[PDB]
Amino acid sequence: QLRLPSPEVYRFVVKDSEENIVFEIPIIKGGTVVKLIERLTYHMYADPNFVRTFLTTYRSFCKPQELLSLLIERFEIPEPEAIEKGEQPISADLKRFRKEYVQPVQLRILNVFRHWVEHHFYDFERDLYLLERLESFISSVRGKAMKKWVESIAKIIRRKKQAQANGVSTFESPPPPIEWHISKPGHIETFDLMTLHPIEIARQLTLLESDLYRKVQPSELVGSVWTKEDKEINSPNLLKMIRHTTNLTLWFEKCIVEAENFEERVAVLSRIIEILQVFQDLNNFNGVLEIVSAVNSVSVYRLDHTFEALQERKRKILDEAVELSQFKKYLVKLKSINPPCVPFFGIYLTNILKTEEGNNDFLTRHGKDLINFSKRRKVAEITGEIQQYQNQPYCLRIEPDMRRFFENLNPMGSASEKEFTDYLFNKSLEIEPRNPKQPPRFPRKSTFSLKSPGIRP
Numbered sequence: 001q002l003r004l005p006s007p008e009v010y011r012f013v014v015k016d017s018e019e020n021i022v023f024e025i026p027i028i029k030g031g032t033v034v035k036l037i038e039r040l041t042y043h044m045y046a047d048p049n050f051v052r053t054f055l056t057t058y059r060s061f062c063k064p065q066e067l068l069s070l071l072i073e074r075f076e077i078p079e080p081e082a083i084e085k086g087e088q089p090i091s092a093d094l095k096r097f098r099k100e101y102v103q104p105v106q107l108r109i110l111n112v113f114r115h116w117v118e119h120h121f122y123d124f125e126r127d128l129y130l131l132e133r134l135e136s137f138i139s140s141v142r143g144k145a146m147k148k149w150v151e152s153i154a155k156i157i158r159r160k161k162q163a164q165a166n167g168v169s170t171f172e173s174p175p176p177p178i179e180w181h182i183s184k185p186g187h188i189e190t191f192d193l194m195t196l197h198p199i200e201i202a203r204q205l206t207l208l209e210s211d212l213y214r215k216v217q218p219s220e221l222v223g224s225v226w227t228k229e230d231k232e233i234n235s236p237n238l239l240k241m242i243r244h245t246t247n248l249t250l251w252f253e254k255c256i257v258e259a260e261n262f263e264e265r266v267a268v269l270s271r272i273i274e275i276l277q278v279f280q281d282l283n284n285f286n287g288v289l290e291i292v293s294a295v296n297s298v299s300v301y302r303l304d305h306t307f308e309a310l311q312e313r314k315r316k317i318l319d320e321a322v323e324l325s326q327f328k329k330y331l332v333k334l335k336s337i338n339p340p341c342v343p344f345f346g347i348y349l350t351n352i353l354k355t356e357e358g359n360n361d362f363l364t365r366h367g368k369d370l371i372n373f374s375k376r377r378k379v380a381e382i383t384g385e386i387q388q389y390q391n392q393p394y395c396l397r398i399e400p401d402m403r404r405f406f407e408n409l410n411p412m413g414s415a416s417e418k419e420f421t422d423y424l425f426n427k428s429l430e431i432e433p434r435n436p437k438q439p440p441r442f443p444r445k446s447t448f449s450l451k452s453p454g455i456r457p
């Protein structure tokens, strides 16, 4: 048995009772933040599953500055008191205390620091003081066994700083050629739904929605922080993914309802159905639901005469997409396809939101509240499926002019979201009014041929 310091001066060695930790290598069910730090840096074993889950979900019960304080407090272990050795090293039982407890614990902390800056460097971008403390502390760790960890952490910090100042941290195998229809490359003014190639529209939208999907970190989904006061700071990538799906859905609605001429409106809807087929060929389920949500809106769905003018095979494909999105059948298709894939966030957000409400944040033992860590583990497992599809990229070339075209898509203009949808429903009542109104007469406004080039590459 080692000679530990007093628990009054190093509270990480407090007798594990029921009022500080609850179990069910043991699985941590809950406990105080002091006990969680000790288990995070426990010397008797190494649980990477516990380090990954902690760093992903710790912000729901501990501030980043507070976590760095606890890890530094865990690092600066005061050894017990020999006294005459002052001005010289000490020996005997301190060698056993340093080799079996001090060295492994301090090595566990450096691995926590290394895993922190590697996968969660955004904590240090939002807080420069947090990065200054770590760099100041890392530069003071003495020892040869820790010199490999100190140089490794400082190397990651440098590489991360080079990535933020550059913007990019793009290797492919053989990418297919870029398709073009009426819009010649380099002429962004002629870019439109009916002038660009439907194959390339779905390709560029899949590549853009894939990049937005891969920038989303799991911590942006913990604690429902995207529906709180600081949602713009806590979930910037998740909200940017949501704002893109809403804008593209309204863009598909805007293209359909603003085609006043009947023949031109049938060509636009047919072009969208073709883009839908390439979306499901690319396993872009986000783009599929953008089109499904567009045709399910009150503005588009009420256009009975437009849908009946389509080919039966055109309607069947669209009806199949609306059927499978009802999301009972969306789970079967996603659980059978391999990456590259762009899944739909909205169903995972629902499973997380209902889990945040289905479990209490704090367990209680004897009047002392413990941090319910099991709630954080279940949420972390829902986010684990998202990172699964983010690993593999798409083997598709990026078109810069088309990328910026879809990045800057703002169909609402300066109006709000509810104001724009009312404009779409009023426009739908103009092109196909309610019965018993007569069919209106609108002339062909397109100055170019609306015939589709096709879906085959």
Ligand SMILES: Nc1ccnc2cc(Cl)ccc12
Binding pocket: 295, 296, 300, 301, 302, 303, 304, 305, 307, 308, 315, 318, 319, 322
């Ligand atoms: N009015 C309609 C008639 C037939 N099929 C339709 C399919 C969708 Cl997706 C929306 C409206 C329809």
